[PDB]
Structures are given as structure tokens and as C-alpha cells.
Ligand binder design. Sequence first.
Ligand SMILES: Nc1ncnc2c1ncn2[C@@H]1O[C@@H]2COP(=O)(O)O[C@H]2[C@H]1O
Ligand SMILES: Nc1ncnc2c1ncn2[C@@H]1O[C@@H]2COP(=O)(O)O[C@H]2[C@H]1O
Ligand SMILES: Nc1ncnc2c1ncn2[C@@H]1O[C@@H]2COP(=O)(O)O[C@H]2[C@H]1O
Ligand SMILES: Nc1ncnc2c1ncn2[C@@H]1O[C@@H]2COP(=O)(O)O[C@H]2[C@H]1O
Lengths: 200, 200
Amino acid sequence: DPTLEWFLSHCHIHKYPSKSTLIHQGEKAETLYYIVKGSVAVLIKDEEGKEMILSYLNQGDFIGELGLFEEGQERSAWVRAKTACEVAEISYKKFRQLIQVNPDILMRLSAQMARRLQVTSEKVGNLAFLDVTGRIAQTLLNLAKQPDAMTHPDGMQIKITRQEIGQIVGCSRETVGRILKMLEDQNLISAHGKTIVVYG
Amino acid sequence: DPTLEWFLSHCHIHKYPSKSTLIHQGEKAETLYYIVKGSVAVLIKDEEGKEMILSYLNQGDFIGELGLFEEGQERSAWVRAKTACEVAEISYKKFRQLIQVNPDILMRLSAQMARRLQVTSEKVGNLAFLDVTGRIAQTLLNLAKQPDAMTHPDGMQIKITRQEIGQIVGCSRETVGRILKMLEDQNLISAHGKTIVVYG
DNA sequence: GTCACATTAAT
DNA sequence: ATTAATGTGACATAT
DNA sequence: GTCACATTAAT
DNA sequence: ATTAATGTGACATAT
Ligand SMILES: Nc1ncnc2c1ncn2[C@@H]1O[C@@H]2COP(=O)(O)O[C@H]2[C@H]1O
Ligand SMILES: Nc1ncnc2c1ncn2[C@@H]1O[C@@H]2COP(=O)(O)O[C@H]2[C@H]1O
Ligand SMILES: Nc1ncnc2c1ncn2[C@@H]1O[C@@H]2COP(=O)(O)O[C@H]2[C@H]1O
Ligand SMILES: Nc1ncnc2c1ncn2[C@@H]1O[C@@H]2COP(=O)(O)O[C@H]2[C@H]1O
């Protein structure tokens, strides 16, 4: 993309090791990010530390954009590297200037914000309409469709901790274990620790 | 605002009576809206008709924007007039042209989308971290802060059905009634049908 | 779900 | 070696 | 929460 | 008049 390589030429690339935190919730937002390589997890915490993953973001996604349209904004969530990342970065101020010379870069940003509101809205619906089992089931099918999913004779095989499934759907690690077990007894999946074969 | 009156001069104003539906979920998105007067409710439904209110939008808010950044998009939710509305409307195509002559109008749009992602994300957190009572309690305090809230010697008085509270927080009408009653026994509110006095 | 431990994976 | 995850049965309620 | 009715508000 | 909301006690489970 012509608009992207141009935008990236005004950015300073930073690398982050896996598991590090790129953005800290509560801090002043003055910088925009863009994932050149790798993936991250956007998450929020309650008053007592419980974590909920709002979304995963990968190659080609902007991050830290919510503070751009108004002064004195704080990061709305935490962002941690899921894999080692290579992230381009640029101050809001300089980005606002590129928007003036070319509004097409703001168009790329908004396209993702729109998509984010659509998917976060769908997550509101899952938390309100589906029980924990329905939410886990849907999560498993989503993961089984992803790129990093391995092929298997009876479906697709995925690797994930019960802690992270619990963080995505909103339940304890113990609850995830009990439901995985129930889905297995129904012959819908095969669970062996962190390995899950989703039949299909 | 100079940019707004200009943008609105390329829009065609339509009026809608209260309770009517401005946008239908599932339909082709080819038009952008903007509330000149009145308020609406953005909502989603499950497979069996249960409704969840994602947000209320008022004077000065854009609507129908999620389909703008990609062809063949469908409305992601339902939008109904909460009060009689006066809504400016414009095709995506013409709006895209105004964006080129002036990118500041896209800046106004994105500011709201960002704000929407922040508040919808906070709603994800409420559904995941707070029990029904906590969600109702928070809802009551929010309503008591709003413009249409009436003053009262012991706090603020609000009018709302138990059906709508249930639609905002994600519980049955019967559940709302039982929790309102419990909050009253704790002297936190005074509930007389649709009238709620939030003490504070 | 939380709790209290007992068992196991994982670096 | 230790640290990061798990597995379990008993429970107290909220949904 | 859902269910089955009995009671009441609201136009 | 009717239609739109509610109020209730008994329950079956999921959280
Ligand atoms: N619901 C969400 N989905 C995806 N990304 C999000 C979501 N909420 C916040 N973010 C991202 O996480 C970032 C946290 O800091 P900012 O608010 O600056 O910008 C935010 C977005 O880039
Ligand atoms: N409603 C919730 N109840 C419990 N844990 C939750 C909830 N929402 C998110 N979580 C998180 O998901 C995690 C799943 O594994 P843990 O039990 O280690 O810790 C849990 C919390 O950090
Ligand atoms: N979470 C949300 N908060 C606020 N407005 C929303 C939300 N989800 C959808 N909308 C609005 O409702 C509209 C439904 O149709 P569109 O998807 O075209 O555009 C959507 C937005 O204008
Ligand atoms: N999880 C949920 N359970 C029940 N009703 C819900 C839920 N989420 C949203 N709702 C809606 O909220 C409404 C509250 O009043 P009702 O019982 O008439 O109907 C309910 C549904 O339309």
C-alpha cells in the first residue's frame, strides 16, 4: 500500500519482546501505534485484578488510537505483546499533520475503529445472551478458524491455556476446565491439557 | 460550528416520530445519519427476540457510520427514536466527497467512534465483572446524572420502566423488580412504579 | 464462581 | 529447580 | 433467569 | 376500552 509505506516512513519502529506491555491503562495518550509484525492482546482489569481480553490485534492493526481525537485522554486499556512485536510508533501531533496532507490515512484508522465497535458490540451480546458454555463453545470455534490453527484428521487442533479462555469469556480457570470436560463428554472436542481438537 | 453547518448543508433532513425505527439491523448500509434534535436507542437482539440496549445517542451524534469504510456492509444494530427526531441524512458517497474537500468532518465522526469503543468496552467490563445488582446500581446513578433528571429533596428523581432497565443491564423485567426492591430496603433508592428517587 | 490444596506441566 | 498451570470436591448464591 | 397468572398503569 | 406494564411465589440451574 502506497499510503501505508508513506505513513510508516514518518514512524519510528520499536521492538518488544513477547509478554511485555506496550500500553499501560490510565496513562497519558500521546502516541499512536501500528503493528508491523507480531500480535498483542488488549485487556482490562477489575478493581481486584481479574482480567478480560477485549481483543487480539495483529500485523497491520493500529493501537493506541482512542486518545487521538481529544486532549488529555488516558489509555483505555492494557496492551501486551502476545508474540515478539515490531511496532511502528508516531506522536499524535505528527499523525494529525499527515491527516491534513492526506486524509486517507485517517480513513484506514477509522475503518478499524468501526470494525472494532462492531466486534466489541458483538461481545456485549455474547456476555448478555449466552451462558458460559455457549461463550466457550463459540470461542473454540473462532480459534479453530484462525491462521495459527493446526490441521488434524478429525477437525482442527488449537493450543491455549484454560486461564486465557477464562479471560476471554469471563469465568474462572476452574469453570473453563469443567466446561471443556463437558464438551468432551458430548464428543464435541477432545481436550488434553492445553491441546484442544475441535471436531468439525 | 463552521464545519457542521457546512456538512449539514449537504444533508437532507428527515423527521421521525417517537418509537419509530430509523435503522434496521441486517440491511444494506449506504447512508450516514446525524441527530439534529431528539434522542434514539441503539439495540441488538438475540435469536429469540431478547433486546439489549448498546447505547442511547442524542443531539449532535452521528448514526449509521459503521458501514462507511467498506462496501457491502450491513447495519450492525437497530436504531429507534426515543423521542421525536429530526435527523439529517446523506449518502456515504457524498460524505466521502466532503471528507476529501475537508477531512475535519471525518475527524468529528472518528471522535465519536473512539468514544463509542471506550464506552462499549466499559460495558463489556460491567457484564463480565459486576453482578446484576451492581449493573443496575450503576445504571441508576448514571440516569440520575443525566440532563432529563428531576431534582428532589433527597437526591434526584428519574422515570424509567423495569423493562428498559432489564434491557440495558441484561436481565428479566422480574429480576429488575426484585433488585429495585432490595435497593429500597437498603435505603439506597425509593421506587414507586416507574418513579425512582436515587438518594445522594 | 470461590476455596483449599493436591498434582503436574514448563522454562 | 522453581515457577506457571491445573485438577477437584465442597459450597453459597445469583441467574 | 423462567413460568403462570393475577393486578394494575397508560393511551 | 384495551394495550403496555407489573407484581409474585415456585422453581431449576448456572455462576
Ligand atoms: N474493544 C477494543 N477492541 C480493540 N482494541 C481496543 C479495544 N479497546 C481498546 N483497544 C485498544 O487498546 C488501546 C488502549 O489505549 P488507547 O485507549 O490509547 O487505544 C486503545 C485501542 O488501540
Ligand atoms: N467474571 C469473572 N470471574 C472470574 N474470573 C474472571 C472473570 N472475568 C474475567 N476473569 C479472568 O479470567 C481468568 C481465568 O483464569 P483465572 O481463574 O486464573 O482468573 C480469571 C480472571 O483473571
Ligand atoms: N456500541 C454502539 N454504541 C453506539 N452506537 C452504536 C453501537 N453499535 C452500533 N451503533 C450505531 O448503530 C448503528 C447501526 O447501523 P450501522 O452499523 O450502520 O451504524 C451503527 C452505529 O451508528
Ligand atoms: N440475559 C437476559 N435475560 C433476559 N432478558 C434479557 C437479557 N438480556 C436482555 N434482555 C432483555 O431485557 C428485557 C427486560 O424485560 P423483559 O423481561 O420484558 O425482556 C427482557 C429482554 O428483552
